Structure formats: C-alpha cells, structure tokens
Amino acid sequence: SKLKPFFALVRRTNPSYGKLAFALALSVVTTLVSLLIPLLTKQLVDGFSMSNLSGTQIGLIALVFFVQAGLSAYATYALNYNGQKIISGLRELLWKKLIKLPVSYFDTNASGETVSRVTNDTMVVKELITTHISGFITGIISVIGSLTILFIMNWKLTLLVLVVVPLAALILVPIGRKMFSISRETQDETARFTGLLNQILPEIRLVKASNAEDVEYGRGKMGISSLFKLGVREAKVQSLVGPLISLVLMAALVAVIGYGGMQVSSGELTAGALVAFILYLFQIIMPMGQITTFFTQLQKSIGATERMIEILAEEEEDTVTGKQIENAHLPIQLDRVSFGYKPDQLILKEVSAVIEAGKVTAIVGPSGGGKTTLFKLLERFYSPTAGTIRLGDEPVDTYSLESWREHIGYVSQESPLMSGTIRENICYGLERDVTDAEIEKAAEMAYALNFIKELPNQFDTEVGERGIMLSGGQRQRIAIARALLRNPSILMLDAATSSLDSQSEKSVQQALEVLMEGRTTIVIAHRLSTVVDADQLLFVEKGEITGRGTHHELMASHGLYRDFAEQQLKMN
Amino acid sequence: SKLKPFFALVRRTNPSYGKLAFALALSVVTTLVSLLIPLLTKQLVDGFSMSNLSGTQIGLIALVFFVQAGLSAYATYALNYNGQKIISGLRELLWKKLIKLPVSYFDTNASGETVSRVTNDTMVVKELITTHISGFITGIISVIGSLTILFIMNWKLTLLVLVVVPLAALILVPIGRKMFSISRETQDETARFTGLLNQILPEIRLVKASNAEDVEYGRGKMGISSLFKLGVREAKVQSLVGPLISLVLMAALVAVIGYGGMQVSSGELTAGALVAFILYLFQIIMPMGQITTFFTQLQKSIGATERMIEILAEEEEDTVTGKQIENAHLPIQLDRVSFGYKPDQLILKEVSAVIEAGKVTAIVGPSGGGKTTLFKLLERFYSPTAGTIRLGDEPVDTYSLESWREHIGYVSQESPLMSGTIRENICYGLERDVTDAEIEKAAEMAYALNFIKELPNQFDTEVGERGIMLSGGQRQRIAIARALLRNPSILMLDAATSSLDSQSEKSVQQALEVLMEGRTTIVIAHRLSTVVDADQLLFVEKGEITGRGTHHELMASHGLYRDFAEQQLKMN
Ligand SMILES: CCOc1ccc(-c2nc3ccc(-c4nc5ccc(N6CCN(C)CC6)cc5[nH]4)cc3[nH]2)cc1
Ligand SMILES: CCOc1ccc(-c2nc3ccc(-c4nc5ccc(N6CCN(C)CC6)cc5[nH]4)cc3[nH]2)cc1
C-alpha cells in the first residue's frame, strides 16, 4: 500500500510504460542467459575428450557471451534513458510548483532545504528506478535459478553444505558490528580530543601570560592518554576480529571447494560440475549485495517520494480572484486588519489606517515589532483573513493579484542582483510589451545611463553568478531605474538608502522624488530622511498603528516619549 | 633516502624495535602457514579414497587453521599496540612543541590547521606503521609464494594463462577512469544546477513582485535540460561500459577455471589440485588491493611526515635568557623601537616613549594603524630586532621572560574562559604558592565572591565546554579577580567593555583602581573614560608614537591636530 504514492508520482510524469517494461524483461532475459553460460562451460569441460567439439563449444560460448553483453547493454541504455526522462519530468513539475508557490511557504519553512530536498530526492528516485528495481529483479532471478540449477546438477551434497555455510554469516555479522561500534567510539574520542585542542589553541596568549603552559600540556597529556587507552582496547578487540573473520571465510571456502574436489576424486557425479559450481557461486554472491542495497535504497526512497508529494501538494492562485483593474489610482484603506502568520498567535490586532492617492506615506516600525508583517500585508504576499486592505469597495479580492503586482514598484533594502546583465536586470518586467529600446534611454531618465557611461559593454556586461564587483551603490540605482521603467503607478520602499553617504544619496533621492512625484509612494524604513519628503507619516508598535498626519511635528505631540525613545536608540 | 626523516621521527619516540620486528616476523610466518594450507587441502582431496585418512587430514587442517589464527591474532595485537605507543609518543612530543611554540607563530600561520596537523597526520602515520607496512610485506610474500607454488604445481599450462588474463586490466582500467570522469562531469553539472536554484529561490519576493515566474521557470527548465543531456550522455557511456566489465570479468573467470577443469578432465596432471589452484587464486587476488593501498598511503604519509617535522622543527624558550628579577618596579622607556613581523616591511620605525612607574598610561591608536603591534610588543611576545624596550637600565632579557610574565596581569577584550570550573580560573595563578585556601577571600576583596553570592556551587561551579551561560561582564570580572590574585605588580589592559553597561563598568573600574592603589597600569583602549583614567597619555599613528603629557592637553591638541577624524568615527 506504501507504493501507491510512488506509482502515482511516476504516473504524473506520463512514463513510456511499454519501453520500461520491455527493458526490464530484456534484463531478465540477459540474467537467464548468464544462467546458461556455466552449463556450456561444463559441456566443454566434459567434451574435451575430443578436440573439434572443444573448438565448437568455445565458439558457442563466445557467441553467447557477446549476445549477453549486447542484450544487457541495450537493457541498461533503455532503463537509464527512461529514468532520465522520468527525472526530467519530475524536476519540471517540481520547479513549476516551487516558483508559483506563495512567498509565505519560503519564509516560514526553508530556503535552501527545499532545493536540497528537490535535487536529492530526484536523484534518489532516479537511483531507485534506473538501477535498484531492475537490480533486485535480476538478483532474485539469479539467486533462485542458480540454487535450482545447483540442486538439479550437483544434487543435495554440495549445495546443502553451501547453504549451511551461511551460518558463517551469523558469526561474521555480530563481529563486524562490534568492530563498527568500537571504531565509532574511537572516532568520537578523537573528535573530543581535537575539540579540546581547538579550544585551547586560540587562547594561547592567555595561556602563556599566566605561565601555566605546562599545566595545559598536562591536560593535553591526559587526552593523549585517554585515546591511547581506548586505542589499546580497539587493538585487543581487533585482534579477535581481524584473524577470526579471515579464518571463518577461508574455512568456509575450503569446506565448499574441498567437498567439490573430494566429489571429483571419489567418482561421484562431478567432472566439470565443479567448474560449473564455482561459476554459479560467483553468480550467486554479488546479487546478495545488490538485493541488500536495493532494500536500503527502497527504505530511503519511500520517504524521499513522500517528501516529493508533500512539496507537490501545495497550491497558489495568481489570476483566480478576477480581472477588473482599470486605473489603480485611489486612496488605500486598512480596515480592521488583524492577522499575522497563524490565527492562534494573532500577530496583528485591529489595524486601521487611511492613505491618500499620490502622496508619500511612511511606516515607522520598531526593532522587532510588526513593520515587516505590515509590509508583507500591504505587499499582498499574505492572504487576508479578517481585515480588509481596500482600494474602496475592496476590489483587491476580485481582480488578479498579478494585475496588482504589475502596477507596484518594489526595492526595499538590497535587492542585490538577478543573474544576468544590466539590460536583463532592468528588463525583468517585460509585460509582453518588450519595451523596445527605451531601457537605456529610461536609464538616462533615471540618471543611470550617464552613470554607466564608462560602458565596459552594453549587452555583455556580466555581473557574474557571485555578483561582488559592483557595490550596493550602483545596484540600487539600477533597481530604481527598473522600477520607474516598468510601470510608475504605485511605489513602495524600505528606503534602500544606505551608507552610500550624501553624495550618492542626494542623486538617487532627487531622481526618485522627481520621477514618482505624481504617483503614490510608501516608505517603511527607520531614517527620517524620507519622512520629511513623506506627506503622511504612520507609526506601528505592538502590531497596532498609532499616528496619522504630516510628520515629526505631529509625533512631537504623540510619540514625544515612546517614538522619541526608539529614535534615541537610533541615534546611538 | 626519503625514509630517513620518517625513521628519525619514529626513533624520537623510543620505538622498542625488538617487539615490532618480532611482530613482523610472526606476520611473515602466518603468511607462510596460509600458503601451506591449500597444499594440505590438495593432499586431502587426493587422498579421499578411504575414510580414516580423510579424518586425520581434516584434523591436521583444523589444527593448522587454529595455529594460523592464533599467530595472526598475536602479530596483529603486537603491531597495533606498538603503533599506539608510537602515536602516543609522537602526539606528546607534538603537543609539547605546540604549547611551547612562540605566540608570533600562531597568529601569523594558522589556528585550527595546526590541530589538524596533530590529529590527522598522527592517524596517517599510525595507519602506515601498524597496518600498511606489514600489509605490504605480507601481500608481497603471499603473491610471490603463490606464483612460485603454482609454477611448481601446474607449470606452463595453467599459470601462464593465469598471468596473461589480468592483462585485461589494460582493458578494464581505462574504462573505469572514463566512467569516473563522466560521473565527475555529471556531479559538477548537478552542483551548478543546485547553485542556480539556491541563487534563484531567496529572491522569490522580487521574482513574484516583478511577475517573472515564467522566465524563472524557463531558466530552470534550461538548467534541467542541460542536466538531462548530461544524463543521456552518461547513460550511453555507462551502457557501453557495464556489460563490457561484466563480459571481461566473466570471460576471464571462464577461461581460467574452465582451463583448470579441462586439464582435470583430460588426464593431464591436475588430479584434485584444481582446489589448491582456486584457493591460491583467492590468496592472490586479495593482497593486490593491500599493495595498492600501501603505495597510496606511503605517498600520503611521506607527505605528512614533512609537516610533522616542520611543526617539530621550530623552537622557543622561556628562561634561557637569564634570571635577574628582583623588584620589577621601574619606569618603562622605549628606545628607538623599530621591528614588526618581518624585517623587510619595517612596520615600526624608531618608536620611543617615556612611561613612569606606578602611573596609569593610556594608548590611543587608529583603526588599522600600529596600535596592535605596539600592544603586543609591550607584552614581549615579539622578539626585539633593532630597538629595545628597556626596563632594568636597558637589559630586558637579563631576567627570564617567564619571570617578566609572572608579574603581569592581562585581560584585553574577551578572555572568554578556560573550560572546566571557576577553580581553574582562580588557580591558573598557582605559581608554586598554591594560594593555600585564600582564593575565596581573594575573590572577596576583589569583589567577586559577592558577585557569586547566589552560589550555585563553590568548587563545582561549571561553565560548560561551550561557555555560553555567562556574559562578558562576569567573565571579565573573574579575569580581573584572577589578575589581582596572581601578582598585582604591573598591569596592561585593553579595557574589555562588551556588555557591562554603565553600572557594571563603573563598579569594575572603581574596584580595579582601588585594588592597585599605586601599581603600574597600562591602557590601550579607545573609550574616553579609559583615557581619562590615566596620568600620562600616548598616541599611535602610522607606526609612530606622537604625543606625550597629561590627558587634557593631549586630547585637546591631538583632536586639534588630526585626532578629530578618529573622534568623529567614535561618535558615529
Ligand atoms: C556462500 C558461501 O560460499 C562462499 C564463497 C566464497 C567465500 C569467500 N569470499 C572471500 C573473499 C575473501 C577472502 C579472503 N580475504 C583474505 C585476505 C587475507 C587473507 N590472508 C592473507 C594473510 N593473512 C595474514 C592470512 C590470510 C585471507 C583472505 N581470504 C575469503 C573469502 N571467502 C565465502 C563463502
Ligand atoms: C585471472 C585471475 O583470476 C581471476 C579470477 C576471477 C576474477 C573475477 N573476480 C570477479 C568478481 C566479480 C565478478 C562478477 N561481477 C558480476 C556482476 C554481475 C554479474 N551478472 C549478474 C546479472 N548480469 C546481467 C549477468 C551477470 C556477474 C558478475 N560477475 C566476476 C569476477 N571475476 C578475476 C580474476
């Protein structure tokens, strides 16, 4: 019943079932031919009584070897190609799901663990499909057929000792596990010793200042003693593990082969059956390891597939709400907004506010308050539950969130870079308009073309995957240029202004304020450099908005103590 | 020639060569017995025509098996025990050298890599001593003896094809290396794809805000398409490999064993000696891996022993200079002090200053100047080259450096913890005076016992190996108490101030100042309280001392001169 999710997930890829089944059957046929090769060898050994049939049998054996090799090659190619196709389909589905998934999932669950899980589990499912299931089938067939053929050919005597010998496994396995436990304990002790040394060494200045180095040496000696004692123990235990194992193996070996040799001398039904027996043992041994590896890999892959389905079970909506955007130019209202991330916690409580259209607005939050939550709420990445973020009559729930997003410009603190060139990084918002060649001209409108006039190149200017040769000063100018290029209708900022100092700050701020003067603006940062240019100021504390009006003149009557205390912490 | 350093290093630990040589000889004897065993098996197989001799030979074989097991067990125990003793000696020598190595070496070269080259190279040398040398000797003996015995047993026919077949290594090994190369290329591609995804995902806020889900999905699809192409190429290359490896190995096995059985059946002498031949094949194939592993580990160990000797090559001293300390109370003067880390750079140039005795002196330095160099120079951690830090009418080495350090208390920025209990913290000053039982009293006047008045425990007060349950203020207070306990004669601080806050800062400053009440004090911090807490002031700039006199005059003049820039940095 646990394989049903795996079958459904593989079905999601629309596999070529016929080709996979044909490849598996061809692998079975190859295993059956490898089950036949030793019989031909036995026939050759028995037929050495004359020389021409020896040559004919050698030719037949070579032909069977080549046929087996070719059949196995084609089966492996079909298996691997189908596995790669299934993995490509699975990765396509997973990446389509991840990108469309709401930003809440990324913030509240993980960022790199998701990509890790995706890649690792796709690789595990590939290993289960292309190798381990066929490997298990081939191993089962090989073991069963070899045991049956040994029973038919060399009969009870030798095969019974062959399957009584695995009592040697009941002596090897506990011994091997004791070796593993002692090795793990020694490794842990070594880790403790190196941790002690790595703790002591950085404070060597303090050690020598106190002139207690000898004492530390003594401490070190104790560690070197401890390991030694444990090491000695390992030695003793290894002296009961190293030889004994070999002994048992050799004993088993001799026994088996010895009986074969004996049955050759006594005249029993064994002339070339001994050679066939050794070849069948060699075909027996490896499939045991293959089966064990398959069992462990299935134990891992069931959980991997469960994680796959857990990723593929989420949902998100982009245009489902509706499509009725026409102007997107109206005062925005927060009405009874009270919701955070989980309804139980209630990180937001009864937040209400008004913002006019075409006026710069500020959102000042404390260090650890609800400024980030309020930003994400206004930025429409969080689904409203109780309150209403309205544009009048609350149309935001009846038209596409993508229509909202196309009309919003956003750069908050860094927005570092999107892997590519400058033209693509300012062309990230091609809403099917292609934007012609306005881009660089708009950069001149954003005072960016004259800033990039040095021009290492235009289209080949590579920021690299790392993105480190450009400081934060140049990238934020590019971000502002892109924001004004896409759709200057409503713009929101965490005031990407930084340590750039007035020289760059003056230019970037004057450009921004002159361009988006006629359109709605929101600022959410802490600095007061933007609040003087913000027509309306709002303050947030304890998940509640307190303060409406012009500016610092009005917080002088409302936040003259609490807001002043946070600003005092800021002056530090 | 290259083994001489290894032999010398082993000799440094008194190897007790007799036991090691006896263990090696016993291993050789065990290998000879293992070579003997298949001949006894062949005797039993040939003699299996009547039952009693079969039982006698089985008993003899079992006795030889047990003798071999016991001899191998004792040889392994002796080898491992001698190796552990050698490693303990080497670790003791290395740790003594490390703890006695100069501080200047530690900061300029490495911190954790030094511990790595005491923990990992010792393990490598152990692997070479206990296992790989004996393993190589026993493998060479086994291979040569088995080839010789097979030559005297089957002569031209079987053993020539025996040797000729593993020339199929010239067919297998290139194929395996091509497999490894293709696997490495695929792994690199998947690593690049994982990096691309881990770069895309954290920018999901910008990705959705700009509404480029389709673009990012397309880029991910291109990445997984490249991965699919790599997988298809790997699939083809593996399909032209796996069946080839199986075919070559099975053709080898069939040729050898079928020829053996063919000789057995024909009448050509082989009787039941095919059993001995198979056992000799099993004793031949195993030690090849041991020989190859020995060669690779010999390369690694001959690389690591040089690092061992280089660590052990360096030297340092603490009392060779002399022993001429009687008072250690005299004004401190700098006389044309010019030395840094390397004579070529000359980071210090003719630094000179006058410091009285019992007068607190403050040092002011810039962010990246030479304040740290002079700070470490005053502690005598760096060897004078040209200039002289004269204390004692010029001779500063007439007395032992340990004696100079003994009269010194030191805590600069953190001085985090010496892991264990507060007993170690207060007893690090146990310079043969044991302090009787006055440590708690010493804590009492030093204003530490009332700080620990909550008393979780007195002697069992534990801080943990990590040392995170106490704050910076408390550990700095304990450091001050230790400094006042050892020898409150001459003191230098960097005024460790991290999280004490005004109350604790003033408390520790007043207690510390009361405690010396007439002993020399040195301060090198940047805080203005620390610099007003000093009768005489200094200033460091460009590796030169510029400024002498009283606090107010210097602070007013230096700020007038150029120190106002550093001050402006301070208010920031
Ligand atoms: C399914 C049942 O059938 C079986 C078929 C084969 C084996 C079997 N597979 C083996 C693989 C390796 C060894 C083996 N590896 C060895 C390594 C070293 C030595 N030495 C060399 C030197 N030392 C000191 C003494 C012996 C013997 C060794 N014998 C024995 C083995 N016996 C067991 C059961
Ligand atoms: C000359 C010195 O003497 C030698 C004697 C033996 C070997 C030798 N050592 C071997 C170890 C493993 C294998 C082997 N590994 C296999 C893996 C798979 C299969 N299969 C299982 C299913 N497939 C499809 C068919 C056969 C057979 C296999 N046979 C062959 C081997 N031949 C080498 C030199």
Numbering used by the authors:
A (entry chain A), B (entry chain B): 10 to 581
Article sentences:
Interestingly, all ligands induce a cooperative ATP-Mg2+ binding like R6G, with a similar K0.5 (56.0 µM ± 2.6 h = 2.0 ± 0.3 for Hœchst33342; 65.5 µM ± 3.6 h = 2.3 ± 0.3 for Doxorubicin), suggesting a similar influence of ligands on ATP-Mg2+ binding, albeit the varying hill slope between ligands suggests that a ligand-specific effect might occur. We solved the cryoEM structure of E504 in complex with Hœchst33342 in absence of ATP-Mg2+ (named E504AH33342). Here again, E504AH33342 is 100% in the IF conformation. These modifications match the ones induced by R6G binding, with E504AH33342 structure being very similar to E504AR6G-25µMATP. Two molecules of Hœchst33342 bind per BmrA dimer, in a similar location as the one occupied by R6G. Ligand-binding on BmrA was similar within the drug-binding pocket, but extruding more within the TM helices for Hœchst33342, its structure being longer than R6G. Hœchst33342 also induces a reduction in the conformational space exploration of the NBDs, confirming the observations made on R6G, and showing a further decrease in amplitude compared to R6G.
The Bacillus subtilis efflux pump BmrA, belongs to the type-IV family of MDR ABC transporters, conferring resistance to cervimycin-C secreted by the biotope competitor Streptomyces tendæ13. They are formed of two transmembrane domains (TMD) forming a cavity at their center where substrates bind, and of two nucleotide-binding domains (NBD) binding and hydrolyzing ATP-Mg2+ to fuel the system. Binding of ATP-Mg2+ to the NBDs bring them together, translating this conformational change to the TMDs which then open towards the outside (Outward-Facing, OF) where substrates are released. Importantly, the E504A catalytic mutant that still binds ATP but cannot hydrolyze it20 was used in this study; this thus allowed to probe a unidirectional transition from IF to OF states, BmrA being blocked when reaching the OF conformation when complexed with ATP-Mg2+ 9,12,14.
